[PDB]
Design a protein around this ligand. Sequence first.
Ligand SMILES: [Cl-]
Length: 292
Amino acid sequence: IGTGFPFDPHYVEVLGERMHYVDVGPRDGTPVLFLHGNPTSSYLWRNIIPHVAPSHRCIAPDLIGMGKSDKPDLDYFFDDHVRYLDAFIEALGLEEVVLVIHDWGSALGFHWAKRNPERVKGIACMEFIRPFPTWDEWPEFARETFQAFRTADVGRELIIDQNAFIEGALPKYVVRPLTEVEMDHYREPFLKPVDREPLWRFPNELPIAGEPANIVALVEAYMNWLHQSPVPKLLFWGTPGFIIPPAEAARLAESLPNCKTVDIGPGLHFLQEDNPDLIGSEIARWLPALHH
Ligand SMILES: [Cl-]
């Protein structure tokens, strides 16, 4: 599995701040927009993009406060990310897109699709955010971890002061061991502790046990949209998975219209780090029939 990031940097200024992004492939078609989540960056997509770039434009931004993007002193609420990504998409002049989304990138992507349904020609998703109506829906062995993340004292200590999301959760939810070179690419945005604010606000925004109410309502809304939308969908899942276990992937296969599911083998949350070549090859194979 490749550890390098052989993508030229691109930058766009939106809402006073520079956002970094990958931009490769042809300009005369429908772009494929790749949205990472917490605590990652476009680095997460590095081994997937090369499968898709031959046929389609690949655009992979670093969310505001993450990756090589600028790091304003924001609260980094979901709503902040929405503002920055909405502006990013318009700054690039995108019209119709295909989305490839994970974690908070999936909340952003599904929320954008719900608001812009005629501009979404397909959604490839994996380990995506859905409501967890009670802590019981949450993976058992991570309930204590995320309950502690979701506090103003202990959660800040762990995630900001001790970098637990990077040093702990990230490698814990990849089945294969991440290498030190890969870990250094994920560490680099967050070398200064104060810059870890998004890594803490994100778990506090997760729709779990009814809280926070604004995010539960928005996530419920995009999931209701998704369940009624005819848009083509490609859902990657692993075993045991994390926020989409195998049984949920199978329910979604039956319940979401025009949905193809792909078993990637072993995986937890960051499926891209366990089987990037199958994810990329399957996205590439699925794109042509979306054009018409
Ligand atoms: Cl999170």
